[PDB]
Amino acid sequence: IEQPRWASKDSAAGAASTPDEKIVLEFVDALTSNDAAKLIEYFAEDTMYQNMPLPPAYGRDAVEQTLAGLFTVVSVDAVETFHIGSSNGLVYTERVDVLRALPTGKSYNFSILGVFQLTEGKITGWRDYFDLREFEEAVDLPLRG
Numbered sequence: 001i002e003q004p005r006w007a008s009k010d011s012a013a014g015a016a017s018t019p020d021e022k023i024v025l026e027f028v029d030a031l032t033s034n035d036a037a038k039l040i041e042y043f044a045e046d047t048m049y050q051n052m053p054l055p056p057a058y059g060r061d062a063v064e065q066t067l068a069g070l071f072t073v074v075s076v077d078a079v080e081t082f083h084i085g086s087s088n089g090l091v092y093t094e095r096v097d098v099l100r101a102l103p104t105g106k107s108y109n110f111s112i113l114g115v116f117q118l119t120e121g122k123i124t125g126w127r128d129y130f131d132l133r134e135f136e137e138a139v140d141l142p143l144r145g
Contacts, residue, residue: 001080001096001109011094013081021084024091024116027123031076031097036068044122052129054145073140075100077107091116099138108138 009015016022027042040060043049049063050056057063076099083094093114100107110130117125136143 001078001098004082007082011083011085013084016084018086019121020091020116020118021086023118023121024093025081025084027116028079028081028093028095028114031079034071034075036064036071039067040064042123044119044124047122047124047126049126050128051132051135052127054132054143069141070139073102074138075102089117091118101138101140103140106138108134110135 013025016025023042027039030039030042033039040063043060043063045060047060047063048056048058049066057066076097078098079095080098081093081095083092085092093112093116095112095114097110097112098107099110112128112130114126114128116123132143
């Protein structure tokens with residue numbers, strides 16, 4: 001999985017330079033855990049998680065459940081973060097997630113730009129934007145949108 005032509009060293013993951021950037025980098029790196037119980041610890045009680053524009057999860061319980069549901073049908077095999085940056089309390093990750101369907105073994109590269117909001121170092125919001133065309137096939141759960 002190569003570096004894109006448009007990747008900029010000035011915003012590379014290794015150049016993350018605020019507490020929030022470093023926390024978010026750590027979190028998306030921990031996605032390969034496939035471990036909802038570990039991942040949920042990064043979230044505030046008052047929080048949200050959405051794969052745009054699918055129905056959002058609000059509240060830590062809902063986030064935990066949807067993360068747990070994901071890892072029953074999908075392994076996040078790799079996360080490759082090309083850019084990380086932050087502005088006005090928001091953190092951006094321009095990246096690629098590699099998802100492998102557990103029942104088919106088929107692998108999928110998703111180009112993602114995600115925005116995170118943290119409050120006192122805990123995730124208050126997380127919205128990933130990417131193409132969902134292959135998402136319905138890749139995740140063996142009914143899309144609810």
